[PDB]
Amino acid sequence: SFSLQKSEEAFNAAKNLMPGGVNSPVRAFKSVGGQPVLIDSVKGSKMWDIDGNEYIDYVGSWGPAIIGHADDEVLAALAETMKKGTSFGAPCLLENVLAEMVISAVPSIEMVRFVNSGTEACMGVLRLARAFTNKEKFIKFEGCYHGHANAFLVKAGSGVATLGLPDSPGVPKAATSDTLTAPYNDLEAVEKLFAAHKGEISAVILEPVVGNSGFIPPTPEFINGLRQLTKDNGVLLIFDEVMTGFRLAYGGAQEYFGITPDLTTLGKIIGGGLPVGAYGGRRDIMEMVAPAGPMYQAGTLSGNPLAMTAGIHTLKRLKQAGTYEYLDKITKELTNGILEAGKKTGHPMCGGYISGMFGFFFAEGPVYNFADSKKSDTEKFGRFFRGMLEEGVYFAPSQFEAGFTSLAHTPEDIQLTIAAAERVLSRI
């Protein structure tokens, strides 16, 4: 009897109010049939839509909800804090507290600047790297996402890796002209870029595990190679940990892999469900940021007390013993259970997980890069995704997004999910 009738009505109205009916493109479900699920509420590992359907959720609002949606302690903290005002536009003690917690948690971060989104964090960190090195070019990887600042919106493909051409209309060629690209997991391509642009490269930036082209982890050779190559040449290494931060380990991907970058961006989890980003790193670099130094970046709502409170209480929960070990346990079971279901029902699949982050592809694999991920059978993914909705499971509405587990997911949530997957896979 599964119905999305109320979502259908409200989304039809939305399309005449907002472009494509949404405030972010993935939300429009275009690759999975075009009927988004409008959300009424979330709690723990569950989401309820406006039709009243319940789902075991593996999106976690794209990463923030690692301790569970609408956590009671976080809500109580927000309720108390808001009595004193939600925005100050001036320093407050909560900013000191969250800053101290982040510096303690994340290996590379000795000093930190809070902003309102991952997009802002990545803008700031790029400007900072360019300012510190007095160099304009940088390297990013095809398939990585660093928000929508113009410099990141660069076209990749045959014959254009060194050209910095725009990947979207409205982005002038000049804006992307200092952006170089290489394939993820291709150290040799990066070596070639270094050789052809001696003295011009400020930084290499990467998602230390790709989550925005599906789940794609780095090979040890690649990620160590980047650390060595950058260090040997006085180039900065930047980890975009907006998604991996506080999710792969308390100290993020840099702790998980034991590789320490020069600068790090954060977001999502550090806002505890409110809009917050950050960039931080080596103190000598961070001292270039205004008003300590000449590099300009500013925000009105940055460091607001609600966001700080939510972040503080989220990190306090995560810092407790056994957190990441629990995520590993349930996510290993989930990932291997889904892949085994695919094997049993005759569908080529591959995938993997680290702590609370996972993904699977309808492809033989292995998947090492963006190009590999494009081998995925997206028609089949769509059938799987829609079938799972009907069975009460909500995965990311795209083959090209990672999935997320939370501390509120139980072993039973996982078992019910695997069972549903087996049923759906047996039918598609």
Place this chain on the structure above:
Amino acid sequence: SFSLQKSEEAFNAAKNLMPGGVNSPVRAFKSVGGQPVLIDSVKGSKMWDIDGNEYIDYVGSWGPAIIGHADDEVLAALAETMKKGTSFGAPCLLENVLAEMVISAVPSIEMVRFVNSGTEACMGVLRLARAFTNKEKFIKFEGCYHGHANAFLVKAGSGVATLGLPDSPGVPKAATSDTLTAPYNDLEAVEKLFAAHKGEISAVILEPVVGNSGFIPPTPEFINGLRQLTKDNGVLLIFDEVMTGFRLAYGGAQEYFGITPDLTTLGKIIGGGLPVGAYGGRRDIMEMVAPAGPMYQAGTLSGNPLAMTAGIHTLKRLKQAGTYEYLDKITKELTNGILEAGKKTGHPMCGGYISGMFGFFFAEGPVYNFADSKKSDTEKFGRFFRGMLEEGVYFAPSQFEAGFTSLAHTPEDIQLTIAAAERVLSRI
């Protein structure tokens, strides 16, 4: 005795955690003596610091607090909404509600996209204008502020006889090369740019009343001229109403002046004290925004239900009869009271106001542009600012920021503020 003991200790600690001890440059008080006031709470028109000092606040968290800080109805709405979760990462009904309200309120907006800051809104609107027109250049005015995207960080004087130059390290030369500039209130300079760059200009963007170089209103000739000139040449007119929106009138400066732009950015008031921005305008233009069209912009926390709720209830209050008439009454009295106090005490001053936005300069004036504003006696401003703190009044900690009133400011507040101003002015 006026004591900032606890603020001094906490700010010293902050300087070892965040660059310059702050999350936005103006907060460090560098132009007014360097000892920021750390905030404990805000309510109505008042702020209390961590040392227990009370102030009548004319900053309003830089614009969001137009109905008063910590409004009971807004807080009650947040308390109810948060029970259902603070972030969904997917569409919800509250997004439809705020979108409808914004479309109704703002003349130019037929379709709207929500984002997490004014910086993001201005990035998006510029990319959109460039995409729609298929042209790369745009015009910005000296003294206007549109957030910190690279294209806007252009050095004073550049972008006229030489390509736009970086105003900050870390901004590549190429990034500002498509930015043209002119003095505010200089229509002739804009006409010259149009004639010199035929087929190359996407848009003119401006604060329709400047608030980021002090308070500087447009002359009728300038703003009327811009609307006709853009129309005549197929160039988009963009109003950055992040600060003026919902403050000069329910429909912002465009309503107040009766001049309808093609695109508008919003922020601040629209989030009711939470991080929210938006860009919107003519439907045919907005249909280019992904996923309706090819122009890329995205955001994880965009349209989150907490921020939507806060905006909805803030706008609901503003829509009540008498709002802007009240703001006009108290702000006229405030502004003229301060200017009269300056005259009586022998200090050259000039200033002005519209509705809930005002400013004064320690300069003879009149001030028509950025260059004029820079004739201000900033040493005297600092003395005035610090003296007023001790009298229990908190103005913006800069000569180059506008001031803000709210529905919670009362004739009592205004009377007390003017009396304090005369006491301080008679002594500095």
